[PDB]
Amino acid sequence: DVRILLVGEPRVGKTSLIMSLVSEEFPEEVPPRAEEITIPADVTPERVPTHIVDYSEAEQSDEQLHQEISQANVICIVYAVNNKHSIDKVTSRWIPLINERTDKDSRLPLILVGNKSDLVEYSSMETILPIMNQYTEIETCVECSAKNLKNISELFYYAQKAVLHPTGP
Amino acid sequence: DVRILLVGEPRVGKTSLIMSLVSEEFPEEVPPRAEEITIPADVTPERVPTHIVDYSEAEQSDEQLHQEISQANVICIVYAVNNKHSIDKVTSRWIPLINERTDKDSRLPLILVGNKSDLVEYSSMETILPIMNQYTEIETCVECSAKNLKNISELFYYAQKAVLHPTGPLYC
Ligand SMILES: Nc1nc2c(ncn2[C@@H]2O[C@H](COP(=O)(O)OP(=O)(O)OP(=O)(O)O)[C@@H](O)[C@H]2O)c(=O)[nH]1
Ligand SMILES: Nc1nc2c(ncn2[C@@H]2O[C@H](COP(=O)(O)OP(=O)(O)OP(=O)(O)O)[C@@H](O)[C@H]2O)c(=O)[nH]1
Ligand SMILES: [Mg+2]
Ligand SMILES: [Mg+2]
């Protein structure tokens, strides 16, 4: 199975991203944590289902976060393109937290997700490129907007492919 | 060296994409074909020297297109999200033509680029997902907007990564 987990600082748009995918429409309001979302195996050529899991610090303990990290086989670290603090925390908090707990005999791909592209005129790539170069665990990066749905489809396609295309050609 | 070639139907935005990458501003006027671009290693996403080549049917012959395909080590097939014809030509023209190359001993990764995302509120993913499924030589896909400077840095990062770190399934 593909088991996707979204982590990242509060209010970067994790839940909104998941619920925008669900309804193909931006929800004006969201709960702290979305329900688990299922993509049936019919979608991928590998005939494998996808599960999408949300994390909310307001609702969940660090013990629960660690277990979610253990269950996931691809982790989207979400930041907001208009929030430097959320980007800083990718390297000061999220990557070390995940890496400390990953199986060193294996690989857990990470995807850097820059949400709220609808708010800004310029790219976050210049800022996140040095993070990419440092951590080969990061499989790819994407900028998107839950508000207008742009690149949301790509986001979860990339996450699936990080698991289903995990080696070379 | 990463050697990128942009192909695709007329007016999908190949030249505008390249010039928006260079200038970080959308050119309201573009020539038919950008001049060949050579970018130093330490200013590119993957830290390797990068060449970017533009194709223009009015400016170049079929022989020159054939030469450019053999020289590239990643090809971005550009379509316009609001032009179904430019999408149909991805499979009817561009992929077969690329597979006419003579030296097939090395994989030539492809990237599907849906430009002009500023014009529409829907994704082209449903349309191009069947293409991705049928043609495993396609490494990834991206939707961008030269006009709004969206996902242009991503596009060229994806292109470099296809050369240096191509991907594939666990089992064939
Ligand atoms: N403009 C804009 N606003 C967004 C976008 N995505 C989410 N928001 C807004 O950002 C705020 C936070 O969104 P959430 O989905 O609750 O973010 P979260 O990461 O789940 O927050 P926590 O659960 O507290 O960690 C809400 O007001 C959303 O409406 C976006 O893409 N663009
Ligand atoms: N709205 C919008 N228009 C674009 C975008 N990119 C290019 N255009 C416009 O599309 C037209 C064609 O752009 P070109 O860059 O000349 O496209 P091309 O693929 O190089 O065309 P040929 O060289 O003739 O094959 C021009 O009017 C551009 O201004 C875009 O991202 N959004
Ligand atoms: Mg939430
Ligand atoms: Mg041109």
Swiss-Prot record, chain A:
Residues joined by cross-link Glycyl lysine isopeptide (Lys-Gly) (interchain with G-Cter in ubiquitin): 150
Highest taxon listed in the record's lineage: Eukaryota
Signal peptide: none
Tissue localization of expression: Ubiquitously expressed. Expressed at high level in heart and skeletal muscle.
Residues that coordinate or bind Mg(2+) 1: 15, 32, 54
Residues noted as binding GTP 1 in the record, renumbered to the chain: 11, 13-16, 56, 115-116, 118, 146-147
Record PTM N6-acetyllysine, positions in chain: 89
Modification comment: Ubiquitinated by PRKN during mitophagy, leading to its degradation and enhancement of mitophagy. Deubiquitinated by USP30.
Domain Miro: 1-165
Compartments it resides in: Mitochondrion outer membrane
Comment field on protein domains: The Miro 2 domain is necessary for efficient ubiquitination by PRKN.
Quaternary structure annotation from Swiss-Prot or TrEMBL: Homodimer. Interacts with the kinesin-binding proteins TRAK1/OIP106 and TRAK2/GRIF1, forming a link between mitochondria and the trafficking apparatus of the microtubules. Interacts with RAP1GDS1. Interacts with ARMCX1. Found in a complex with KIF5B, OGT, RHOT2 and TRAK1.
Function summary: Atypical mitochondrial nucleoside-triphosphatase (NTPase) involved in mitochondrial trafficking. Probably involved in control of anterograde transport of mitochondria and their subcellular distribution. Promotes mitochondrial fission during high calcium conditions. Can hydrolyze GTP, ATP and UTP.
Family (UniProt): Belongs to the mitochondrial Rho GTPase family.
Name of this protein: Mitochondrial Rho GTPase 1
Organism listed in the record: Homo sapiens
Gene behind this protein: RHOT1
Interval of the full protein contained in this chain: 4 to 172 of 618
